[model samples]
Structure formats: structure tokens, C-alpha cells
Target chain A: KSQIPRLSAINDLHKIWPTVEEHGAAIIESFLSLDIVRRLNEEVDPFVKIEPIPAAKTKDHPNHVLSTTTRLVNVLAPISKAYREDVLNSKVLHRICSDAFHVYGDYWVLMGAVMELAPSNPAQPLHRDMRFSHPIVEYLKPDAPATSINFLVALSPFTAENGATHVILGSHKWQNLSNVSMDATVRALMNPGDALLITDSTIHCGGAETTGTETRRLLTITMGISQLTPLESNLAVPRPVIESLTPLAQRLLGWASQRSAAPRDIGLLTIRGNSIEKTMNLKAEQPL
Target chain B: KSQIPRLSAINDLHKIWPTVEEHGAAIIESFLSLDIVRRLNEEVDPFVKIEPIPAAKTKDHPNHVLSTTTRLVNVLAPISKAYREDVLNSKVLHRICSDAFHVYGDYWVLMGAVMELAPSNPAQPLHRDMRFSHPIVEYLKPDAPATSINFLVALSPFTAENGATHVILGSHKWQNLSNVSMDATVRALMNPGDALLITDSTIHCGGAETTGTETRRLLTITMGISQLTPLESNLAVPRPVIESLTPLAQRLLGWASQRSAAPRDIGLLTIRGNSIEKTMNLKAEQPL
Candidate 1:
């Protein structure tokens, strides 16, 4: 397995974008600055709850899960200030998504979860996350208008000891994913703060941590086209939190509905009699 | 009130396209030939269930339904040959939807119902048909990318005495639809076989039939972007019927999956490890 793109966040979008387009995924080394990385881990430490992998879940895909030492934190956006201010709001990530996901008109984070894979943690199935919205992801070629894009950011060293995430490069272009052989798959190796961006059509899974001491931690985010139902419900976020967030963040988190590529096509449930933003700002007990 | 554009099927696309975009609806006089009209009525005669509009539905909007004499025929695609051959497969209608709904990449008939309003029948509510798909229809402007388009073809004379369809001219762009006065709505009167095309955002309602003997029957079809759940289920149609239908008709009816605007983006569930079409053709009892 050769290394993926290892570029800094400088004027490397020109290089990074092309790599993702050709390979269906790219690795950005040191995507988060050292200071930001330290702050993220500190903020996340209190929330990393450890739990056994459910028997029912493992039974559904016996080959997918390697063990029972994993835990996850779903809905990471509203958890801490650092998640919102740093990772989700990162400019370099947005720039790449905007250019790559342009065919979708607009994109939003449909799912967010942080994985803690200890030496005994269960693994993820080799799957395409786009199945959350529709089964059509199977036929979708890598060059298709980008409706789904995903990210796995290493919170700890993604070494062989801790079972680095595995990706089958160029698999997005293949017509049959079920018939794939593991030999084609590459175990993604990266230092903390490095990011792996995967197209929705790509094939990937988590590896079991073989070493008894080292642990693997990863932040996962999947963005889809504006119209589909979101996996992580943004409704749980408090109004106070929503009111104070950045406008772009608010929209991306489903605080707003989506408009289609054309001006006439709009969706996301709005009362035509009023705009959501204006309604949210109204004084309590105000009559319509 | 002034009537909408009345065009024939012959060489009318040049004039018909712009009217729909500007007004969010159009009237095509004699859209179906007299022979086709007679055939359609004959085929639908046996299937017309003359039932009263449910009180639970009627009470939801009293002003919307004038009486309980109305009847409806849902899933009209498989009812008769004339419907599938002449109406749903009409080239003129497809051309307009293709151009208007281009921003959505591909469009399909998401719902189809034929309404029959007898002399004492209930009326339609002042509403948008697109609500079946998304409340986001409320926020969508007429100029937004086209995701939904509708049609009401008169099977019987659409007369004021019989209470023809009502449409608010240029209401697609309005910021508020609820505050409108009744004076703004224009009645749609047309001869049998004339088609009334409506944009998804425009406000419209069915009128009460005042005549003691006359009846009003309107064939309704709504086309939407392919990703959302369909209102009319296509599964009931037999496989033999599906195998014999036109390729486009089969797809429009949801027997096939949908691909997005780009070659890479695809949706509408496909068992990609296998295609729905290929699987449908396999010999029975053949094991994997």
C-alpha cells in the first residue's frame, strides 16, 4: 500500500483536489495545526464513552466486526466549542467540498460520529456510507455528480498496531464492489490531525487494533446533497446554541432548508407564509 | 378573466415552454385528440369509484370542499391503454418537463390521480400539490430550479357552471400565499381534452360544480425530481405489464432507478451488485 497525498494546508488545494478526484479519497497530513489538535483532544476527552459492541450489530455482519473494544460519540457538532470552531468550520475542508460537491448545489453534514477503537474494539464493515439515503450509491460512479463526501480524521496515530482505517483506492470507479478482494485495499497510515476524505462511492472499513496497549481514535463526518434526510438530527441542538452559531454552520446543520441547483427548485420545509429565520427571531407570545 | 395560452400539439413547444416558466402554469386547448378522449373515458368508466370525500379529510378544510359528491381515481397509469400510450407517454409534455426540470437532472411522475366531480361533489382545497413531496415547496420561488410540475387535463368540460379549476396568476413568486383575497384567483375553463399545466409553487384549487346535471372530471399528474419517495406505488402493476411497457414509461413509473445530473451521481435504489432490470429478467429458481 502506497501512501496517499501528504500535503499541508497551504496553496495545495490545486494538488489536493486532483488527487481526490482521481483516487476517490485523499490524505491531508497535519490538516489540523498542533495547537488545534491538542485543544480538540482535550475537549473530546470527557465525552469518549466506552461501550461494548452490541451482539445484534456484530451478528448482522460477522465479518465486519473484529472484536468488542470500540465506542462512538454521535452528534459531535454541539458537544464542544472546539468541534464547531475548528474542525467543522475548517476553511480548507470547505473549499475542497465546495469545489468537489458543486454538482449538488449545496452540501450539509448529514452524519457526524467519533470512533474510539481500543485494542479490543469492533471494526466497521467495508461499506459505502451513502446507503443511509438511498441504495443508488451502488451504481454511482466516482465521476457522478458528487452527492456524498466523507471524512475520517485521525485523532491518534493511525498505525498498524492500532489498526489504521482501510480504503480500497479507485474502487469508486468499479461497477461491482461486492466481488472485491482484500489485496486491493490499503490500510491508511497517518499521524494525528491528518484527514482522509472519501467519496460516497468508495469502499472502506475499520481495522481491528491488534496491539493490546495502543488505541485508535477517529472523527467521522459525511456530507450529502442538500435535499436528503440527515442521519444525525440537528433538532436536538438547543435554540440558544443555534442562535449563536455562524450562519453557514447553522445552515449546514439543518437549521435551514435547502434550495436546489436552480432558483425555482427549493425544499427543506418552510412555511411560505413566513421565513424560518424571521420566525425564530419573533418575540415569545407574538401573534401571527 | 383572460384565458391562458391555447396551443395545439403541432409545433407548439416554441410558444408553450416560456408561458409555463413565466406564469407557473399554462392551458393547452385540445391537448388530447377527441378519439383519445373518448377512449380514455370508456376505459376509466368501470374503475371510477363514486365515493363521498371522507369527512375526516373534508373537516380538515371545510372551505376547501363545497360538498361530499366528489370521487377520485388514484394510480391511473395502469387503468387504461389510452392513459399509458397517449397521456403519460406524450412527447410534448415530456419535452417541457425535460427542459424545465433540467436542474434536477431527471424527473419522474411521482403521483397520478384522476378527479371526478359530479353535480353535487366536493371541491378541492386551495393548495399546492407539491406538499406531497416536501413542505419546502412553500419556500421555493417560481424561478428556482424546477423539481415539481403538475397537469390537470379536462375529461369533461371545465365550465364555470360546473366549477372549473381555479388558479392564481403569477402566484408562484409571491412571498405570502395565505393573505390573498379571493378576487385574485382566476377560474380555468376549458373544453374537454384541454390540459392545464401548473408549476409546483403556484396556488390553485378545485371549484364547486353549480350546475345541477353537469359533471367535472380532471386527470391529474405530478412529476417530481426522482430521489424523493413516490406518492403512488408502482409495485401493484404486474411484471408482465411492466415488461411490455415502453422503456421510458417503465422508468417514469418507478420500475427503474434514477441517475443524477452527473454520470457519477446516481440514486433511486439499485441493487448495484446487481441491477433491478437484469434481476427482473433472470430465470426463476436460479441460485446465485
Candidate 2:
């Protein structure tokens, strides 16, 4: 794939490239600091395995063997500075993640971490994020690429011996694929403080953590423009905790659930009373 | 039938009896007075009609006719004071009407007076007022009595030759005769100021006029407790006109047709975006 020269800010990318090359993907390290992760996790419940992922049933099919536990613990604004700077600096990663995903309006980027710990079991097949499914494809098509994207940080060492993530590097560009053995795949290895930026189209799988007794914990930080809808379904976030955050953080976690401030494309509009005009113009900016 | 003693205002019968019995049926004259009718017609571009009754129909039904063409003329409220006073004074009509039909609750009273000219042809088939229908019985039950009652006023001289209203005295209380004929079997005569009180059960028809070029006019005032639901299928008045009336008028017309007041039973409450509390309350109010 052709590579564009790296730049200092988002404006440079906008002026040079309209779209990312095929299989738009990149990896960034130190996107989030360990100190912030430790502080934020103090308020969050320890991540626990929610469901068991059974073994893959077929050679061609893939299984997702991971657990996610989340709660509205804190605001995202405090860490916005670090995230914005990383996007401005990184070339391959920013080009693939930021440029590919569009944020037409303001938004907050929520913070959560995922630990891809493979138990003492057989190898798992490769799979893309669920958002890559057809319904998502059709929905995000008009907007081009996607309106939002996610990121993962490496907390524990991701080594070949400790079940490193196996990826078909350029598989994101392929619309279809034939069955192939996993012998030629690349295993992602990184120490604490390293991060990997993967779009929804990337094909990857969890390898078994046969050697490590401690789980592979990764602190994840997702960054997207303000226009994209939040992953959380509930629009109401508890007060005090949400209010403490900066304005940008509140926008990300659905704090602006009403339409009072500005126009947003998210599904926040609701009708009330006899006048449709008055109801439609209400700003989604109520604090509590 | 037994008669309650006189001079006792609190007598259960006196509460409604005097009004019902005296007028025979409660009546409110000039519900929509001539000035109101004229003004409304000018402002709303209402369906105005002025035509002589067909000669043959007039010969069959002698009462001269003046209809405002269609329902819901905006002038209904300007004459509300006259309607309220007439309704309060006609205690006998209320009593007799309530006793005979067991009508109850606040009901919408609607009326417009029309003048009848000499028959160009035959008279109309004599028939009683529509307040006696069974659906009305169902609406006023459980709390009040029946949903609606009526008042009729002769705006012009009503004579036998000019087709004064003919009423079948005591026919309202006759059960066996109900199935025999729904049309009027008697006639009623009155001077310009004379009013006729007809219960839902009263059976009377418009009279035929053989002499006099002067047309007969009558004001019809329907009074009752308001309906439990806003859905009144037989409403002769349109929603906008009814909605434009005062709170008192809306209460009498049956819950608001547009903006529902805070009183849950009197209006339809609608909550728009971000009103979690109101929406929750509304959900709780609805039956499973």
C-alpha cells in the first residue's frame, strides 16, 4: 500500500488524504499512560469473565473467547489531551483509525480496558469485531468508513509464548476469503505501555495463555469524533460523577442526551406535545 | 311512579327532579346565538346553507327548519354563560331526565338554533332527539348516570298548523312501545319564548305548518356531565372549534381535543424528549 508522509495535526491529514488505503490499520504505543489507568480503575470493579466462549465448531468458523465488564465509573475529558496528541503525532495509526472514521459532530471518548486472556485450552479461530457485520456495513455506508472506532492498550506483555494476538495483516481489505492454515500469520508482541489500534475490519484471534499464570490485562482507550453515537445504550448517566468530567468527556458517554446545545446525528430526539416544531428544536444539552 | 315531597331542595329527587320535571327536559336556549353564528360563519368559511325544506317533506313534518349546515362553529363559547345559567335553573328537567334514563357524569352540551320556513312540500318524519342512544347510557354509568341530556327552545311561534313539535306525553317511560316506532307519535305547540324539555326517552317530532309565512325557529341545548373519554364518535362539532373553547367549555365538551391540562382525567398528557419522569408516570397510568 502507498504511504503518505506523516504530519503534526488532523488538519494536515484532511488536506492530503480523503480516504485511507486498503486494509486501513495501524498500531500505536503509549496512547494512554499507566498512571491514569491505575487511577480510573480504582473506581471501576475488577474486570471479570462474564460468559464462557465454547470451542470453535468448525475449521473455517471463528470463536470469540473474551469477557467484557463495564460500568459508568468516570468521565473521559481528563484524558482527552493525551489521546488528541497521539492522534496528531502517529502517521500509519492515525491515518487508518482517525481519517477512516469520521466524526461530523462533537463526541466524548469513553475509557475501558479489555484483557484477551486465553485459558488453558485449544487455539481460537480469527474473527473481526461484531460491528463489521452486514447490518453495520449498510448502516455506516452512507457516512463512509465508520462514524466511530475503538482502541486497546497493552497492560501485560503480549508475547508469542503468552498467547499473542495472531493477525492476517492485510485481511481487512478482502471482502471474502477462502480457508487457509494459520502457519504464515504474524503474532503481535508488545510490553506494558504499548498499544494497538485496530479498526472493525481487522481479522484477529486470541491464542492460549499456556505459560503465564497472571492474565494478559490491556488498558483500552477509544477515540472518535463527536458525531458518532456512544456504545452505551442508556442515555442517562448518573450525576456528580458525570458532571465532574470535562465537557468533551460528557459528550462521549451520552451526557448530552437532549438536543439543546447543538445538532447531533445520534438517536436522541423525541417528540412531546402538540407542536412538532418546538419538540424537534430542543437542545440535547441538559446536564442532569 | 312515586313522587318525592315538595319544598325539600335536598330531596334526592329535587337535586335533579325539579329541573327535569318542570321543563320536562333541561333546555339551554340560543346555545350558539344568531350573532355568534353569523360571526363564526364569516371567520371560518364554514359550510353555510340556506334552503327551503322540500315541499313534500315540510308537509309531512311541519316545524320550520334552520340548521347551521355542519357541526363545530367557533361561536359556541360566546354563548356559554347563557347555557350554564339555563342548565342550572332547569332542575325539574334534569331530575326527570336522570330518573328515566339513569344518566350521569359531566357531558358535552352542543346546540345551534335554526329557523323553519313554511313547507314548500311535505313535512319531515317526526323523530325524538338523539340523546337517548344506548352508548350514552354506557358512558354515564359507573359514576354519574347517562352521558347526555337535552334542552329545546322555540325561537318563533310554534303552532299546530305551523308544525309545532308534537310530543307523545309519558311515552318516554313506556317500555313496550320502544321497539314499535322510533319516530314521534305526538305533537308539541309553543309561543316564541316557550321551551320544551325532552329526555333521551321523550318521543316528539317537528310539526307541519299549513298557514303563516313566518318560519318556526328552535334552539337546541344538550346538557350532560363530561364524557369519560375524548373519543365521542357522534360529535357534531369539529375538534379545533371545541378546543378553542374555554376550560369550562372543554370540560363540558369532553376532555380537551388538543392541549391537555394537568388534570389527568380532563386532558391527554404528552411528554417530549428528556422528560423521563413524565413518560414514566404516563406509562404507570395506563392499564395493562
Candidate 3:
């Protein structure tokens, strides 16, 4: 419980990277500017709508609501300019990602979303964001770099009273969740504009609100190694919406190239008027 | 490869199970009756359909065709009675599976399929059938039980000329495929009625047919623990087909229970009102 590392500066990537490897998560205070946080909150506010807690969980804890939005690039559009500039240009985030996934090749943003937790909401079940990568994660060395990473930016004050995110320190090193304890978890408290960076394999959840009347808001952007499949389909986004973004945003959304360089073409035949075009590369015809 | 184990008896569960745990795969000769094997091939023959090698795989190796039939219990109907009875009641299979997935609770057939490899078929890429479970398998102790298991039954003679399955001994302990070598894989040869049992996380694949003129046929059945989702949605089988199965067949096809018991209900409400009490387990109303 006490091993979790909390950093006071955003530029501490060297320190944060190792901490994240050992503990699965680390916090950075004042990672973003107040202007960016306010703008993101203002842009996503109107779109937020009340959603009931899931039924199986409702019996244990009731009268809670949640508001979530994905594809933040489209939802915020040009209005999220400050956030895009700060995050995309953040040297610290890029360095950490590069170091963590260096063995796997390059890295890129898989998807971004904003979430709001309303009053009386119960703590979400603790889970790893990279649950789908369980097979690969099991074999990795305890200090091995992560395949995926996540950044949670506070759009509002994250306080004990408001149910800050809870994380089990060093739980990522454990083989299974059988030994994990919720009581051993440490809460991540941050003022608006602070962010928490965590390895995707970390055990964490949004804490339950016990007394706060105001809703808690955060923007979570998950990044993954080049070889891993993104959770969100970049192609599913409308072409117009994609074209509207800057080049960096487009690349981050996976429009630049295939996630992996492995040749995927197998059983394809090409012909040109009674003759087979033996040298034609079909994959080259389509943008990745 | 030379270290891979092959056995002569089917009832030797204790001996076979340990070999599979250490080597990821083991073979047993003459595991079924010739009559049963003949009957299975005859029944599945009419349903087999030719399928082209996937486009992405063709360039690497070509001139390959696959004849496959999935959900064999449905396609073969009541004619597969002996095969089903022998497989389901096999003490060896049950013992190995029970030991591998004991931590996750009971296990059941995830899916079953039969494949016919046409002459000239290239070797398949080596892979772990439980690739999705990589994270969990990596951390398991070398002797720890498996989360999933696979069985391959030879309806025809399995020989070097006929493309016998290739397995790398102890490759299950390897962290990645980068260092794996095809030269290290040993062929699992068997006559008609023989079978190979392996852990799902084992590194293995169908070997290339070099000289055989006749098609090589085998039935591959994969089993997974109760906590994991099955590869095939057995419930999706046509209602008539499902109803035709015996009770034991029905349970193996997942008609008796949910695949993963994790609660997933969202925004559900239950009430007894309007003089007509609506008592319903919503999940019960839906076919799994």
C-alpha cells in the first residue's frame, strides 16, 4: 500500500517510468495547464448524460450515474486545442512511452475518452485496461516494460471526499488477483490539471463517492505499442472527422501506417486481362 | 523436439498428463476403435467444404486448400454417437483437463472442428492455441495446470508424408516466438484411431504435406475452463440441431450453463406489480 509513487513534476519521466514498471502506476501533479483542463471540461459538459449503474452492481450500491464520451478528438474538435497541443507535444509522455515499449517497436495513441462520475457512484471493479493482453503479460518478466499505458487527466479536483482513483501498489507484479486487497490500495488525489500515468496492466478503479455532491470528471487517454491492436477502430471514425484533425492527431489515431509491419497478405490473386499480375501488391493499394 | 513424448496407451492419464504439462503436448497411439474412426470420417465427409488459404498467408506459402467442418456435433448429427461417447467419457482427457483448469473451476468443450489437409498444403504458422491467454500462462509455474487443452484425433494415418502435427518440446515455457525454430519441432505420427493431447498454450502447428497424394484428416477439439469465454458460441447452433443432441452433448455444447459467470447486466430493474408478478432471470430468458 505504501510503495506507490507520487511525483510532483511532469518532467520526471526517468523516475516515473521505473516506478510504473515496479508499481504499475505513478502520479504527476500539475501535469496540465488550468486553461486546458477548463476548456476540456467545458467542451465535454453539454454532451454528458446520465447513465444508470449496471444492474449486477446496483444491488450492492444504488442511486449512481455515469457520463462518458469516446473519440474525444471528434467530440472536442477544434475547441480542445490547448489539450491537444499540450498532450501531443508533451516530451515526458512520449519519452516514457518510447522507453516502456521500446522492445515492441513504436507507439501511438489507441483511443481517448472522458468520464464523469456522479454522486453516490460506487467504486468500479478493479481491473487492468490491458485485460485482453493477459496471455502475453503472464510470461513477461516482473520488471519488463508494458505493452500499453494510460494517462488519466483530472478535469476537476480529485479528492478523497470526491472519490479519487484507487490503485493497488505493485499488484501488476502479481500473477493473479487472488491476493490483491482493496484495503491496501492508495487513493490518487490531485487538483485540476494533474494527471496519473499507469501501465495498462495495473489494477485500478475509479473510487466510489461517499460524500461529494459534485460530480468527478477525468479524461483518460490510452496509448499502446505499435504491434498491439487498438481497442477502438480508427476507420470507424467518419472520414470527414478524421480529415478535420491535424497531421499529428491523424497519425496518433493510426491513420499513418499499419500497427505492425508483418506482411498480412496471403491467398490473394491479381490479374490484368487474361494474364496474372504476379508482382502486384494489394496491401499497397489501400492506406493503412 | 527429440524430447517430445509419445505413448502407446490411452488409459495412462497419470503418465500422459505430466508429459503434456512439461512438454505442452503428448501423443497416444490407437486411442480409439477403428470402427469409431471410420464412422466419424464417413459422417463428416459430406459436410466438408473446400476453403482457400487466407490471403495474408498465401504469399508466404501457396497451393493450399482446407476442408473443414465446425460444430461437428451438429453436422454429424446422431451418427457421431460412438466418437462423442468415447471422447466425453474418456477418463484420461477428463483427468488432464480437470488438473489443468482446477483453479478456474470445471471445464467443458469450447468448440470442436474437423480438418482435411489437401496434398501440397504448406506448414501452418507455429502458435499457441491459447494465445489470448498469454498473460495468465506466462506466470504459471512450469508444472502448474493449464487453463485450456486441445485434442487431435487422426481419422487417417498420420505420417511424415501425410503432414503430421509438429511440436517443439518444452516450447510452452518460452516467452516469445522470435527464438523458436521450425527445425526443433518433432513430428507427432500416429495411425488411424490415434490421438494427440496438448496444453492450449503449447507451441505447435500442422506440418506441411510433402509427398502424400491423399488428404490428411484430423478432428481437433479445444476445451477451456468455465471462467473463460468459449471460442465458439455453441448456443448459436440452430435450434433443431441443438434439440437433437443428448443431454451430455447439450451440456458440452454449453446449453446447460453460462460460458463465463461474471455478472454483466446493465441498468436492469425487477418488480412485482399490476397483479401479475414478473419474476424473471433475464439471462435465463436469453440463449447463451
Candidate 4:
């Protein structure tokens, strides 16, 4: 975080919150360096069966296409700490997670890794982000609350011909997914350094890339809040990771929360002020 | 003038200007009425168009359709005196107009009556709204400023099956028009009560209607400012139109400009400074 500029300087993360709240998604530009992204890509082991093209176009594939480098994994190693503490700490991510989960009781920031390749056909199957409506324990109990948000940062250039991500706007508010038909969705083509911050509630999916010389890469991160516990356990950077960082980086990870004295902690209590005051007095009446 | 609601109800207009300034355009949702849009469509003649097919059929030609209605003129019919006045006096509109002049000297707003119709095979030829960068004179100087904004309000639901307006985003800052290509452009589909606000710099065109039971109808409004006077002789509404409505509407239209003093016309005299300073003569000797 010390090396990284303010979240606002990297991109207007806070300013984009309202639009993301409204549409269930927003895109930010240049959240990470391409050199770092390239390095991370080199580290990941190719684990999946990546068919670069259908049986029809093998001859037209890249002349130097590496057979072993087709399916990359673990490319998010370098900036995992920055992703959680700095980028996710941004006001934009916080607001979206707060608003979405306050109603649902469970939130998630699922798979955020490098997107090293794009599907290569116009006939590729269309789909939405994996859907989950499982009742969270908080949602099951009467008073608990929960919500989730997914943010995708385009680390490399994205184009329609290069298989850009697409979204169906306002689909988040649509009740009964069955009633909403394909006639409403849109294929969104975004550029490099652009970020797409969206919720699980939106109907979105990746479009097929027809042609492009460079590999399309993206870094995805997500955040959620619940009265119970987060769906993803490793949201905050671990204490060990935070300790290894510089002072400024520690602050962005919310290390200051650990430093407050009891009384100061009470003063710094940001939520439920009036309610807490009333509860405190009620408990004092029968103090042992 | 009395019919419109509190101008503050449309205070959302103020928020809209800054967004448009940054994005070069912004969609202001629920900007107009569904009923007014319906009435306007009813008065216009419909043009013939293409029809859709059932799942993958081999024998049909690509659905190409067009409209005979070349021009649908004078859309300001539904803009009542009060409503029009409210629009004129609205702080939001004022700021938008001011910025429009600052950014590009001229702006335009066309109402629903101008919603284009398909006449023959494929609607009008795909073309930009106007010749990009046409210069206009202001105060008889060659360097006068000119800029325009195109506003599209959906009267009927905009869908993929039906022809939707297409747009190329971020094309405004392009330095040379010839260098811009249609390869990157994408089609935009929107629903009723949605607005598509854009400028002349973006390359956009009406798409062909392939198949649909209803005609794709929209209320089109363009707002622009020019140094030349001929675009519109009077930016002000006619006195009769201004007098025909409620107080709220009158204020919006600026009819009261001649009747009462406003901050623009008065000096910054509201400060509570010492009365002793009031007698000091600041007037120039030549004015008397």
C-alpha cells in the first residue's frame, strides 16, 4: 500500500460506488501493473484442458503457442495482500458490500485471479455468474443481515473481438430469474485498466473472443458482510502478511483497529451509536 | 407554470450535469412521461419493417427493414408552459446548459415527436448525428463555440429483437474522425422510461428492426448551443406559453426573469457587513 498510490489516484474507486450500487457493477481502470501481472502469470501452473481453438482452426492458432502454458493458475500470488487491504478497503467496495449484504446476511468475494485467455468463438454458450440463493444462517434467523459484491479489474486490454465480459444491466432487481428472458441482456466490451465491480445478483457472463493478438487478462476480487460470518474466510489479509508490510500498508489493512485502548475503542465505535448508548445504560442498572 | 412539481424534485438534474461533463454524456432515468410518449407516437405514422424467425432456420435472408418516415418534426408539443418554464429555470438545466456552452458552445434538446420511423429495407443509412466538428460563429467572431447533446427517451421497451440505438463509447476525445472506425462500435438496447444521452462526437446510428410486434418508439431530444443565432431565434419560451401554466412551471421556464430580480442580475449584496461601509461611493464617474 505504501508503494501504491491512494485508491482514488489509481482510479476513482469512491466516485464509482453510486453507479455500482445502482447497476450492480462498475469498472475501474489500471488497478495493477502489467509487469506484475505478467510475472504472476509465469508462476501459475497450467492445470486445465484449454482448447485454444475448435478442431477447425488449429492451423490458424498462434505460431508459437506454448502447449504447456495454456491453463495458468495461482497467478494472484503477488498482489493478494494489496487486493484485500488496499483495493478492497476502498470506499466503493465497502459501500457495495454494506448495502448488498445488509439485506441478504451473507457476502462473497469469489475467485479473483489473472484472466490469461478468452474463449475463442462467437457461438460460445452465454451464461451468468454462478448463482447461489442458499439461505445464510443470518438470513434464516429473524434479525441478522448479509450481502456480497464481486469486482473485476481488467489488468490487460479487453475488447469484444478479444472476448470482453458482458452484463445485463438492471437484471439484479428482476424477480424470478425465469421470468426475465435473454431479450434483455447486453455484451459489455471494456478496455485495459478498467474495472468491473458487480454483485452476484446481476446476470453477467464472459463473451467469446473472435480475434486478437494479445491475451486478455483480468484481476477479480470480491467482498461481502454478514452477521454470521463471511462466505469467503480469507477476506482480510492475514496478520502475518500485514505485519510484513510497511506502516502505511498496515493502516490500509485496518491494523489501527487493533491498537485502540478500550475507552478509545468505545469512542471509535463507528456503528450503532445511539442504540449502544441506550443498551449501555440498561446494563449499568443491574451491574454486579 | 403551476402544473410542474417543485423544481427541487428535478434537483436530480443538478447531479446529472457533472456526470455528463466527465462522461461526455449520462442517462437521466425517468426523464419524461410514458403517456406523453404514447400520445406522440399515436400522432405519427408508422413505417414497415422486418420480422423475426423461430429458432435456427436455414432459408431466410438476414432480417433487413426500413421506415418511410424521413423526418418527425417539432417534438416540443407536450412540453407545457409550466413544464417548459421549469426546465428553463431548473438549476440543473441551467448548469447543464452553462457547461454545454463551456465545453462545446451549442446544445440541443429535441422532444419525442422526432422519434425516427423505418420506411424501407433497413432504416436510414448508418450515419453520425451531424457532420462532426462543424464550427459556428459567436458574437460575429470566427472562433465562437458550438456543441450539441442528443437525448433519447424510450417510449416503448427497447429490446434486442427490436432495433435499438447503437453507440461507441469514449469516441468523443478522438482527434481525427477519419481514424475512427466502425469496428469497435456496439449496439445499445434499453427499456421504456430509460434515457440514452450522448453527444455528436460519438458514432451512433439506429439499428434495423428484425422482428417485433410493436414499432420501436422513443422520444428523441437534442440539446446544443451555438455562437450563431439561427439555430433558434429565442432560447426563451413564448410569453403565452409561459403564462398558461402553474407557478412551479413558470419559474422553471424563466418567465419571471423580466419580472423579478435574480442573483445573476444583482451584485453579491447579501452579506451582513458593517453599515458604515454602505456610504462609500464605488460607482465610476462616467456612468452618471
Highest TM-score model number: 1
- Interface RMSD, one decimal, each candidate: 12.7, 23.8, 13.9, 35.3
In candidate 3, stretches whose alpha carbon ends up further than 4 angstroms from where it belongs are A1-140, A143-157, A166-197, A200-288, B1-10, B29-36, B46-49, B54-94, B104-111, B120-148, B166-187, B200-211, B224-288
Report the alpha-carbon TM-score of model 2 versus the true structure. 0.37
Pick the lDDT winner: 1
lDDT of 2 by residue, A91-112 (tens): 5344544454332332234233
CA lDDT of each prediction against the hidden true structure: 0.65, 0.39, 0.58, 0.40
Off by over 4 Å in 4: A1-288, B1-15, B33-67, B78-95, B102-113, B119-126, B132-146, B179-182, B230-239, B245-288
Candidate 1 local Cα displacement, residue A97, angstroms? 25
Best-to-worst order by DockQ is: 3, 1, 2, 4
Give stretches of model 1 more than 4 Å off: A1-288, B50-67, B139-143, B282-288
lDDT (tens digit, per residue) of candidate 3 on B39-129: 7787667655533332224433222222221112222333355545566556666776667765544466755666777776778778776
List, residue by residue over A1-288, the lDDT tens digit for candidate 4. 011111332456555555656665555554445554454434432422233322113321121222222332221323454443445345545555555544332233333444456345332233333222111111122222213456666656667677677666765665456745445555445555546766656666655557745566666664543111111112123335544544333322222211111111111111111121222221211211
Name the top DockQ candidate.
3
Q: Please report the interface RMSD of model 4 to 1 decimal.
A: 35.3
Docking class of 2: incorrect
DockQ of all candidate complexes? 0.04, 0.01, 0.05, 0.01
What is the alpha-carbon RMSD of candidate 3 to the true structure?
Answer: 10.8
Q: Cα lDDT for residue A242, model 2? A: 44
Native-to-model Cα distance after best TM-score fit, residue B79 in candidate 2, in Å: 30
- lDDT string, candidate 2, B141-220, tens digits: 12232234455556556666776665655555544554434243444455444456666555566555676464555555
